[PDB]
């Protein structure tokens, strides 16, 4: 059951990280940085054993430095 355990753990902490990343992004939005109207709609997490990926979609694509700011906030 090693693969099942690895993918169960990997998909668990991802939700708890996204939960607080949303709070940090909301904090940045109320101040002047990422700006409003940059809000994701669907987020999908894919796990294959240890390795995992995270995909978030947007209606209006944020500019280049917005991507850096949000990626740094998430990491």
């Amino acid at each position: 059951w090693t693969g099942t355990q690895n993918d169960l753990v990997n998909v668990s902490n991802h939700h708890m990280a996204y939960d607080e990343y949303k709070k940090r992004v909301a904090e940045l939005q109320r101040q002047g940085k990422i700006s409003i109207d940059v809000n994701d709609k669907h987020h999908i997490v894919r796990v294959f054993g240890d390795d995992s990926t995270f995909i978030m979609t947007y209606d209006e694509p944020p500019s280049a430095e917005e991507v850096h700011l949000m990626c740094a906030t998430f990491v």
Binding site: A26, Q29, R30, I36, D37, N39
Partner: protein, 50 residues
């Protein structure tokens, strides 16, 4: 002397003369943003409170 035998001349001219200094003032219109300021951020719908 610096001109030649035939002279080129002008028939009509229009110039404005004034009699008093008080007449020298005119008027133009402005917006007075104190009560009707210029707009920004046009009307939008509400979908993302935060």
């Amino acid at each position: 002397a610096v001109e030649m035998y035939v002279a080129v001349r002008i028939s009509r001219f229009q110039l404005e003369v004034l009699r008093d200094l008080h007449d020298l003032v005119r008027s133009r219109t402005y917006l007075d943003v104190s009560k009707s300021p210029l707009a920004t951020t046009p009307i939008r719908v509400v979908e993302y409170v935060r």
